[PDB]
Design an enzyme around this catalytic site. Structure first.
Site, PDB file in Angstrom:
ATOM      1  N   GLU A 178       0.799  -1.173   0.107  1.00  0.00           N
ATOM      2  CA  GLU A 178      -0.100  -0.081  -0.144  1.00  0.00           C
ATOM      3  C   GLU A 178       0.878   1.382  -0.083  1.00  0.00           C
ATOM      4  O   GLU A 178       0.585   2.331   0.668  1.00  0.00           O
ATOM      5  CB  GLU A 178      -0.739  -0.008   1.035  1.00  0.00           C
ATOM      6  CG  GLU A 178      -1.986  -1.223   0.916  1.00  0.00           C
ATOM      7  CD  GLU A 178      -2.852  -1.254   2.112  1.00  0.00           C
ATOM      8  OE1 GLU A 178      -3.600  -2.278   2.370  1.00  0.00           O
ATOM      9  OE2 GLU A 178      -3.003  -0.459   3.238  1.00  0.00           O
ATOM     10  N   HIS A 279       9.590  -9.222  42.131  1.00  0.00           N
ATOM     11  CA  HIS A 279       9.900  -8.341  42.758  1.00  0.00           C
ATOM     12  C   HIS A 279       9.803  -8.199  44.208  1.00  0.00           C
ATOM     13  O   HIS A 279       9.390  -9.319  44.851  1.00  0.00           O
ATOM     14  CB  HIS A 279       8.582  -7.168  42.517  1.00  0.00           C
ATOM     15  CG  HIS A 279       7.321  -7.126  43.096  1.00  0.00           C
ATOM     16  ND1 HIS A 279       7.260  -6.974  44.278  1.00  0.00           N
ATOM     17  CD2 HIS A 279       6.426  -8.114  42.751  1.00  0.00           C
ATOM     18  CE1 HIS A 279       6.061  -7.192  44.750  1.00  0.00           C
ATOM     19  NE2 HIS A 279       5.616  -7.883  43.584  1.00  0.00           N
ATOM     20  N   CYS A 297       1.717 -11.220  40.283  1.00  0.00           N
ATOM     21  CA  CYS A 297       3.155 -10.959  40.500  1.00  0.00           C
ATOM     22  C   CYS A 297       3.912 -12.150  41.260  1.00  0.00           C
ATOM     23  O   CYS A 297       3.300 -12.676  42.246  1.00  0.00           O
ATOM     24  CB  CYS A 297       3.545  -9.607  40.979  1.00  0.00           C
ATOM     25  SG  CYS A 297       3.409  -8.066  40.001  1.00  0.00           S
TER      26      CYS A 297
END
Length: 350
Positions: A178, A279, A297
């Site tokens: 395109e 963490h 987590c």
């Protein structure tokens, strides 16, 4: 015999692509002079081969330009002169590619090549063909598109440590569909380091770090509670943070919603775009090794989080098993390994 002049373009040609240099060759004679100038009479840099037989441009040719080539060849049989004018591609759009991982980096055995364009690619096949991956030791891999803008390349199994990977994204002058052409080429080269695979087993609530097959760390962890479970599957380690404000709205969930949050945390290693981190979680050290308490987590102790931050690198692997969750989406952004090889290999260049 009179000398003959042959070019890699022809007089009157249109849509000449600038992904390759323009060259001129003499037969039955040698090239005496070759000049190529753009619309404004500015010369293009070029070089004649020592034997006089081949001349070629030496700098990038421009989009949307009309170039005029003048060449003269001389031989024992006399002289020949030609003048050729051609026009290069006129893009409707340009897209710039951005490649990960960074040049010169050492990354883990789970790290895919990532090429992300700043525009939707209408011709995925053309994009794939213009990306040159070299591997050493050589290994087979394939392309798979995560969305309309970012394509990934990886082998069937985790990289063998010590593998060189070279990524040439040769999109300049390439029609990506395109009327969209590459704004530029980009290059990156990286190397695969140690095999680092950390496995979190919900049955034991232990995150085990294995380095080249050896257990080097065992971390009590608290993962997602039943209502917000950690998804099973293979996660690729992304970025590392000494500290970071984890904002749930980054990952689609409004902070003020019941599963929302905003927490300042230390020693955070991201392992999904969906917001899963390893963490420091001082608030749940009591639950770690025992019960799941988080939003998804992998909560671990402060010292273990910092250990993880210190010892884990981009492209290392965290595998989660036996949770009540489903499986991490293959198109997460860091979940590429959860797509079966046959599906990955088949691609979606459509």
């Amino acid at each position: 015999l009179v000398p003959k002049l042959t070019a890699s373009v022809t007089d009157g040609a249109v849509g000449v692509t600038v992904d390759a240099p323009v060259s001129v060759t003499a037969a039955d004679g040698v090239l005496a002079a070759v000049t190529m100038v753009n619309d404004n009479g500015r010369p293009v840099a070029g070089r004649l081969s020592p034997d006089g037989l081949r001349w070629s441009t030496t700098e990038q040719l421009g989009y949307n330009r009309r170039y005029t080539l003048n060449a003269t060849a001389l031989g024992l049989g006399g002289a020949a002169t030609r003048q050729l004018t051609f026009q290069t591609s006129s893009p409707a759009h340009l897209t710039m590619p951005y490649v990960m991982p960074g040049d010169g980096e050492v990354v883990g055995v789970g790290e895919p090549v990532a090429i992300r364009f700043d525009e939707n690619i209408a011709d995925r096949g053309a994009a794939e063909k213009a990306i040159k991956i070299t591997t050493n030791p050589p290994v087979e891999g394939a392309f798979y598109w995560l969305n309309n803008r970012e394509v990934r390349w990886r082998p069937e199994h985790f990289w063998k440590p010590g593998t060189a990977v070279d990524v040439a994204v040769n999109t300049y002058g390439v029609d990506l569909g395109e009327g969209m052409f590459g704004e530029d080429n980009v290059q990156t080269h990286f190397t695969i380091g140690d095999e680092v695979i950390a496995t979190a087993d919900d049955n034991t609530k232990i995150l085990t770090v294995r380095v080249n097959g050896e257990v080097v760390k065992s971390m009590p962890t608290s993962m997602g509670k039943d209502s917000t479970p950690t998804a099973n599957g293979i996660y690729i380690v992304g970025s590392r943070y000494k500290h970071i404000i984890m904002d749930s709205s980054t990952y689609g969930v409004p902070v003020n919603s019941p599963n929302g949050y905003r927490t300042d945390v230390d020693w955070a290693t991201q392992i999904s775009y969906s917001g899963v981190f390893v963490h420091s979680a001082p608030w749940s050290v009591g639950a770690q090794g025992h019960t799941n308490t988080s939003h998804g987590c992998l909560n671990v102790s402060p010292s273990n989080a910092q250990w993880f931050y210190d010892h884990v690198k981009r492209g290392d692997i965290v595998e989660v098993v036996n949770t009540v969750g489903g499986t991490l989406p293959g198109i997460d952004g860091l979940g590429d390994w959860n797509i079966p090889w046959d599906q990955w290999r088949a691609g979606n260049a459509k």
